[PDB]
């Protein structure tokens, strides 16, 4: 049974609700982004209308085989009427194709559902500037002040400099980057660009990247692993055993691996600067964990919410324990008292 924070009152609509069977009264199912916790349930057998971005629609069709007749892609930044209700999709600054959804209810209430997002000041100059929001359904993944991490641009600067230095000292080093979902593509794309290489990967991952509308993608990626000195591997293989096993397969072309594991936040963020990050090393293999986040920091979240001034906030993450829910409610009340709304 579908929880309350996935229903949109006063409409026939749900958000990210595909794992509960047929939801009573749902005439349109919105999908914010192609991450498995959110799409859990969709397949070729789905026969209700799905509303989403163009990129999410390409993934639904090619990766999950949803039939074309049930896929309803909408452009971004454009007022659209769905089942007699005005909606807008906005870029969420999460993974490719990820959106926030603004719903203009028949009674006059305006609701914003963030999906998963990484808040940014550029959002203060979208179509959100123009009017009031009564209800915010908020991605609270990192809603506590201990969650700190750098900008994505600082993290990419560290990875490019680290890779370029290593392969210039040793032309026979291979670079490996872990993946398990869409998102964070700038990590392997930026590194391959500085090294003058295409990125090598499996047929399955190539297919997924081909759905993403990335400009000049055919110039950037390949399934021919031998021609490439940046390889992608599933995240589970990013360990000393998995990497040794991979280097054997490369036919004595390489004598060293440098690997990157993009993570979310980790508690080494509470002491160390990005500059001071060091790898784990065994022999000719070194592994860097780098804190490249596609969710808001505490400070980014607080700025967004204090600017938007919603009348009510409904969290969508960390909602399963009394202590988590209580902690989030405390911060929402500080923010409101500090800013005066
Ligand atoms: Ni996500």
DSSP 91-104: E-SSSTT-EEEEEE
* 18 and 81 within one domain: yes
CATH number at residue 98: 3.60.15.10
DSSP 8-state assignment for residue 48? S
Task: Give the C-alpha distances (Å, rounded to integers) separating 316 from 7, 130, 137, 252.
Answer: 11, 25, 6, 49
172: containing domain: 148-295
**Distance, CA of 132 to CA of 130 (rounded, Å):** 7
How many whole angstroms separate alpha carbon 33 and alpha carbon 294? 12
Task: Give me ligand 1 centre to Cα 94, in Å.
Answer: 7
Resolution (A): 1.4
Q: Using CA atoms, how far apart are residues 229 and 209, in angstroms rounded to an integer?
A: 18
Q: Which of 295, 312, 327 delimits the end of a domain?
A: 295
Backbone angles phi, psi at 119, to 5 degrees: -50, 140
Question: Ligand 1: distance of its center to the CA of 237 in Å?
Answer: 22
Secondary structure (3-state) at 313: strand
Q: How far apart are CA 292 and CA 277, in angstroms?
A: 13
Residues 310 and 194 in one domain: no
Does one domain contain both 112 and 229?
A: no
Pair (44, 74) in one structural domain? yes
φ, ψ (nearest 5 deg) of residue 79:
-70, 120
Residues 13 and 139 in one domain: yes
Method of determination used here? X-ray
Distance 170 CA to ligand 1 centre (A): 37
Count of Cβ atoms closer than 10 Å to residue 80 Cβ: 13
Whether residue 113 is found in the same domain as residue 166: no
Beta bridge mates, 89: 101
**Rounded alpha-carbon distances, angstroms, from residue 47 to 42, 65, 251, 297:** 10, 12, 48, 38
The DSSP letter of residue 51 is: E
Domain count, the chain: 2
Ligand 1: centre distance to CA 17 (Å)? 14
Give 193 Cα–ligand 1 centroid separation in angstroms: 26
Residue appearing with tokens 């399955």: 204
The CATH number of the domain holding residue 285 is: 3.40.50.12650
Do 84 and 1 belong to one domain? yes
Report the residue count for the chain.
Answer: 341
Cα–Cα distance between 13 and 31 in angstroms, integer? 11
Same domain, 183 and 282: yes
Collect all residues with Cβ–Cβ distance below 8 Å to 84 and sequence separation of at least 6: 106
Token pair belonging to 226: 């031998």
Query: How many CB atoms within 10 Å of residue 163?
Result: 23
Q: Are residues 218 and 235 in the same domain?
A: yes
> Does 138 share its domain with 67?
yes
Ligand 1 centroid–CA 255 distance in Å is 36
Ligand 1 center–CA 101 separation, angstroms: 15
CA of 309 to the centre of ligand 1 (A): 24
Query: CB-based contacts of 237: which residues, under 8 Å, 6+ apart?
Result: 178, 243, 245, 246
C-alpha to C-alpha distances, 307 to 190, 224, 237, nearest whole angstrom: 33, 48, 42
- The answer on 283 and 159 residing in a single domain is yes
Alpha carbon of 318 to ligand 1 centroid (Å): 14
- The residue among 189, 191, 200, 188 whose CA lies nearest residue 162 is 191
Q: Does 203 share its domain with 338?
A: no
Q: How far is the CA of 117 from the centre of ligand 1 (A)?
A: 8
Q: What is the dihedral of CA 3, 329, 91, 189, to 10 degrees?
A: -100
How much distance in Å is there from the Cα of 169 to the middle of ligand 1? Answer: 37
């Amino acid at each position: 049974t579908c929880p309350f924070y996935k229903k949109i009152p006063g409409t026939g609509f749900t958000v990210d609700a595909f794992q509960y069977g047929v939801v009573e009264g749902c005439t349109a199912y919105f999908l914010t982004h192609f991450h498995s916790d959110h799409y859990a349930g969709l397949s070729k057998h789905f026969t209700f209308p799905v509303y989403c971005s163009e990129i999410t629609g390409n993934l639904l069709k090619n990766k999950l085989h949803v039939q074309e007749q049930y896929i309803h892609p909408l452009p971004l930044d454009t007022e659209c009427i769905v089942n007699g209700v005005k909606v807008v999709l906005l870029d969420a600054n999460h993974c490719p194709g990820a959106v926030m959804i603004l719903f203009y209810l028949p009674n006059g209430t305006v609701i914003l559902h963030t999906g998963d997002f990484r808040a940014d000041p550029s959002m203060e100059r979208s179509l959100l500037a123009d009017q009031k929001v009564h209800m915010l359904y908020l991605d609270t993944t990192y809603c506590s002040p201990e969650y700190t991490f750098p900008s994505q641009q600082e993290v990419i600067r560290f990875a490019i400099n680290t890779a370029f230095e290593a392969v210039t000292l040793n032309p026979h080093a291979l670079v490996v980057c872990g993946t398990y979902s869409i998102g964070k593509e700038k990590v392997f794309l930026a590194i391959a660009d500085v090294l003058g290489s295409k990125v090598g990967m499996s047929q399955e991952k190539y297919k997924t990247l081909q759905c993403l509308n990335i400009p000049e993608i055919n110039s950037l990626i390949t399934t021919d692993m031998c021609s490439s000195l940046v390889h992608l591997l599933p995240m589970m293989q990013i360990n000393f055993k998995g990497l040794q096993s991979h280097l054997k397969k490369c036919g004595g072309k390489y004598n060293q691996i440098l690997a990157f594991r993009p993570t979310g936040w980790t508690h080494s963020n509470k002491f160390t600067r990005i500059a001071d990050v060091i790898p784990q090393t065994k022999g000719n293999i070194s592994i860097y964990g780098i804190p490249y986040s596609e969710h808001s920091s505490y400070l980014e979240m607080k700025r967004f919410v204090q600017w938007l001034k919603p009348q009510k906030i409904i969290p969508t993450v960390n909602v399963g324990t009394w202590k988590s829910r209580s902690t989030m409610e405390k911060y929402f009340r500080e923010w409101k008292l500090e800013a005066g709304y």
